[PDB]
Design an enzyme around this catalytic site. Structure first.
Site, PDB file in Angstrom:
ATOM      1  N   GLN A 104      43.911  40.192  43.511  1.00 33.41           N
ATOM      2  CA  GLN A 104      43.138  39.219  42.333  1.00 33.41           C
ATOM      3  C   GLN A 104      42.437  38.366  43.184  1.00 33.41           C
ATOM      4  O   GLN A 104      41.303  38.300  43.156  1.00 33.41           O
ATOM      5  CB  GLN A 104      43.086  39.188  40.462  1.00 33.41           C
ATOM      6  CG  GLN A 104      44.318  38.100  41.808  1.00 33.41           C
ATOM      7  CD  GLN A 104      45.019  37.302  39.821  1.00 33.41           C
ATOM      8  OE1 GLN A 104      44.164  36.732  39.041  1.00 33.41           O
ATOM      9  NE2 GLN A 104      45.928  38.310  39.464  1.00 33.41           N
ATOM     10  N   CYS A 130      42.881  37.958  36.152  1.00 32.22           N
ATOM     11  CA  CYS A 130      44.213  38.805  35.825  1.00 32.22           C
ATOM     12  C   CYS A 130      43.993  39.788  34.792  1.00 32.22           C
ATOM     13  O   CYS A 130      44.581  40.756  34.457  1.00 32.22           O
ATOM     14  CB  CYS A 130      45.456  37.574  35.794  1.00 32.22           C
ATOM     15  SG  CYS A 130      45.209  37.213  33.979  1.00 32.22           S
ATOM     16  N   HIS A 180      49.402  34.035  32.404  1.00 30.36           N
ATOM     17  CA  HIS A 180      49.116  35.272  33.249  1.00 30.36           C
ATOM     18  C   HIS A 180      49.032  36.905  32.483  1.00 30.36           C
ATOM     19  O   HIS A 180      49.089  35.999  31.297  1.00 30.36           O
ATOM     20  CB  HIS A 180      49.982  35.328  34.340  1.00 30.36           C
ATOM     21  CG  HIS A 180      49.623  35.850  35.257  1.00 30.36           C
ATOM     22  ND1 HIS A 180      48.049  35.670  36.340  1.00 30.36           N
ATOM     23  CD2 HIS A 180      50.386  36.725  36.010  1.00 30.36           C
ATOM     24  CE1 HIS A 180      48.389  36.586  37.078  1.00 30.36           C
ATOM     25  NE2 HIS A 180      49.355  37.024  37.380  1.00 30.36           N
ATOM     26  N   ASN A 222      52.133  43.202  39.043  1.00 27.59           N
ATOM     27  CA  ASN A 222      51.807  42.106  39.720  1.00 27.59           C
ATOM     28  C   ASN A 222      49.963  42.702  39.587  1.00 27.59           C
ATOM     29  O   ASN A 222      50.157  43.731  40.134  1.00 27.59           O
ATOM     30  CB  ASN A 222      52.611  40.863  39.550  1.00 27.59           C
ATOM     31  CG  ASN A 222      51.625  39.701  39.686  1.00 27.59           C
ATOM     32  OD1 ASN A 222      50.610  39.702  38.653  1.00 27.59           O
ATOM     33  ND2 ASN A 222      52.624  38.781  39.489  1.00 27.59           N
TER      34      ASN A 222
HETATM   35  N1  LIG Z   1      44.600  34.939  36.195  1.00 23.05           N
HETATM   36  C1  LIG Z   1      44.700  35.092  34.565  1.00 23.05           C
HETATM   37  C2  LIG Z   1      44.370  33.941  34.139  1.00 23.05           C
HETATM   38  N2  LIG Z   1      44.665  34.351  32.803  1.00 23.05           N
HETATM   39  C3  LIG Z   1      44.034  34.379  31.825  1.00 23.05           C
HETATM   40  O1  LIG Z   1      43.002  34.949  32.426  1.00 23.05           O
HETATM   41  C4  LIG Z   1      44.888  34.532  30.586  1.00 23.05           C
HETATM   42  N3  LIG Z   1      43.749  34.310  28.963  1.00 23.05           N
HETATM   43  C5  LIG Z   1      42.664  33.153  29.188  1.00 23.05           C
HETATM   44  O2  LIG Z   1      43.230  32.301  30.633  1.00 23.05           O
HETATM   45  C6  LIG Z   1      42.251  33.164  28.290  1.00 23.05           C
HETATM   46  C7  LIG Z   1      41.351  33.585  27.227  1.00 23.05           C
HETATM   47  C8  LIG Z   1      40.308  33.573  27.064  1.00 23.05           C
HETATM   48  C9  LIG Z   1      39.083  32.645  27.796  1.00 23.05           C
HETATM   49  N4  LIG Z   1      38.302  32.488  26.983  1.00 23.05           N
HETATM   50  C10 LIG Z   1      39.630  31.705  28.545  1.00 23.05           C
HETATM   51  F1  LIG Z   1      38.857  30.793  29.242  1.00 23.05           F
HETATM   52  C11 LIG Z   1      40.600  31.411  28.686  1.00 23.05           C
HETATM   53  C12 LIG Z   1      46.282  33.514  30.120  1.00 23.05           C
HETATM   54  C13 LIG Z   1      46.711  33.633  28.761  1.00 23.05           C
HETATM   55  C14 LIG Z   1      47.403  35.203  28.491  1.00 23.05           C
HETATM   56  C15 LIG Z   1      46.087  35.932  28.088  1.00 23.05           C
HETATM   57  C16 LIG Z   1      44.839  36.032  29.628  1.00 23.05           C
END
Ligand SMILES: N=CCNC(=O)C1(NC(=O)c2ccc(N)c(F)c2)CCCCC1
Length: 215
Positions: free
Chosen positions: A19, A25, A162, A182
């Site tokens: 990514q 993710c 994540h 991953n």
């Molecule tokens: N590279 C990955 C970053 N990890 C994520 O995207 C996770 N989700 C959020 O971080 C998130 C979810 C909804 C939003 N609107 C937002 F801003 C952020 C983290 C929490 C679990 C689901 C995924």
């Protein structure tokens, strides 16, 4: 459910992706669960487009993060998702440029695993195929993983940050585990994978936000 399952052996899992800087993710996790259902339904494995999700799931925040359930709902409402070759990953959010001519899968909805229930997660992986999951991946011990069944007492099940893909489950040296794909490339972990402790008090929050698409 069987005592062990590894969908990589059944050809349900595409190569490990990377990514990069973008917080996508959730899109790689969602694509991996869709790829598994596409293989189960049609017999053919193809890379699907996380960029299509980053740019087009308006209920998520692109490279700022998102939820997998919102991604599955988008694919269902959109009547398709493009292949990776039709809508390549570029590592930044853009306007939605989905093209239906590049459609390579559809989605008929999704289900969520009961919060915190690793037995229900196991039964879903056994019945369905790869399942999207979220974890606390903030510890340097997670990030430096190389071998064995990962467990760190400091992992925080209430700090999900994540999203990854559970492609199977099993045991190694008596330690129950989840087989996790991953999206940090093949140079990370063990060829891009990590075995994470299973039934160890929902270690790293593995069963707190799990879901899979219907096809
Ligand atoms: N590279 C990955 C970053 N990890 C994520 O995207 C996770 N989700 C959020 O971080 C998130 C979810 C909804 C939003 N609107 C937002 F801003 C952020 C983290 C929490 C679990 C689901 C995924």
């Amino acid at each position: 459910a069987p005592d062990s399952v590894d969908y990589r052996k059944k050809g349900y899992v595409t190569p490990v992706k990377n990514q990069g800087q973008c917080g996508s993710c959730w899109a790689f996790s969602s694509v991996g669960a869709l790829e598994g259902q596409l293989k189960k339904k049609t017999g053919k494995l193809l890379n699907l487009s996380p960029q299509n999700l980053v740019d087009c799931v308006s209920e998520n925040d692109g490279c700022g993060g998102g939820y997998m359930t919102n991604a599955f709902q988008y694919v269902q409402k959109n009547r398709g998702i493009d292949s990776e070759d039709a809508y390549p990953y570029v590592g930044q959010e853009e306007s939605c440029m989905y093209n239906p001519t590049g459609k390579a899968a559809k989605c008929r909805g999704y289900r969520e695993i009961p919060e915190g229930n690793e037995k229900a997660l196991k039964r879903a992986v056994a019945r369905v195929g790869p399942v999207s999951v979220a974890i606390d991946a903030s510890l340097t011990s997670f990030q430096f993983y190389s071998k064995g069944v990962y467990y760190d007492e400091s992992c925080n099940s209430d700090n999900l940050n994540h999203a990854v893909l559970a492609v199977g489950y099993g045991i190694q040296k008596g330690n129950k585990h989840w087989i996790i794909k991953n999206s940090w490339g093949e140079n990370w972990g063990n060829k891009g994978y990590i075995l994470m402790a299973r039934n160890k008090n929902n270690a790293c929050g593995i069963a707190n936000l799990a879901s899979f698409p219907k096809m």
